[PDB]
Amino acid sequence: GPSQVQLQESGGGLVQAGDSLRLSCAASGRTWSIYGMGWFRQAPGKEREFVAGITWRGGNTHYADFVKGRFTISRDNVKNTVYLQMNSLKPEDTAVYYCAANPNPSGSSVYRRNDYWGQGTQVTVSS
Amino acid sequence: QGQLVESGGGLVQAGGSLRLSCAASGIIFRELGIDWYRQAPGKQRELVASIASAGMTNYADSVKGRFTISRDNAKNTVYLQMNSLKPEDTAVYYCHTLPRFSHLWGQGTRVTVSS
Secondary structure, eight states, X not given: OOOSEEXXXXXXEEEETTOOEEEEEEOEESGGXXXXXXXXXXXXXXXXXXXXXXXXXXXXXXXXXXXXXXXXXXXXXXXXXXEEXXXXXXXXXXXXXXXXXXXXXXXXXXXXXXXXXXXXXXEEEEO | OOEEEEEOOEEEETTOOEEEEEEEESSOGGGSOEEEEEEOTTSOOEEEEEEOTTSOEXXXXXXXXXXXXXXXXXXXXXXXXXXXXXXXXXXXXXXXXXXXXXXXXXXXXXXXXXX
């Protein structure tokens, strides 16, 4: 639903195996209360899962085990944007990619363990 | 409060190199990522280079391979090594970090690339 901080993905599309792709997420609203952001993927029939995360003021990053050094997450806390540089994409990476902000320790699911969510952008990898 | 004091810059021939410095004070420098921004004529202020507290660096596409950002936590300063300068790079450069809720900006150092 609506929220204090609004998130907005873009940059998804159709590519083939080995190609690169760069997602971005525009944060708006009470952007000063943002302490961390992350990229998640919702694979077909599957619950969304963590891909990459970044701390807002430290800029420190962390990646899921299937990233294998292929992806790079970065943020611009002045422009209020977070980016995911996806290199060497594989057919297994095909999923809806969601932008999220502010992890929450309490919550029964990944969705409820983050305060703010975007609306998702489709990433499709063929070949 | 916190203060960012930029030094260096000025006029330089294209193809030459400059080195900017930004001394920080009143903030916990080790725990913060530091950024270099710049405002070129007619363009919005844009990000140039970032270095996280863990050392990872990002660069804008137009400066990849030419610029290098680095930090010295003992001196509480961040450097921007600019090589192969071009009139593209003529702008007012700004040191930046976000300690709490308000953005912390340096005063703005001018870089003018001539021929």
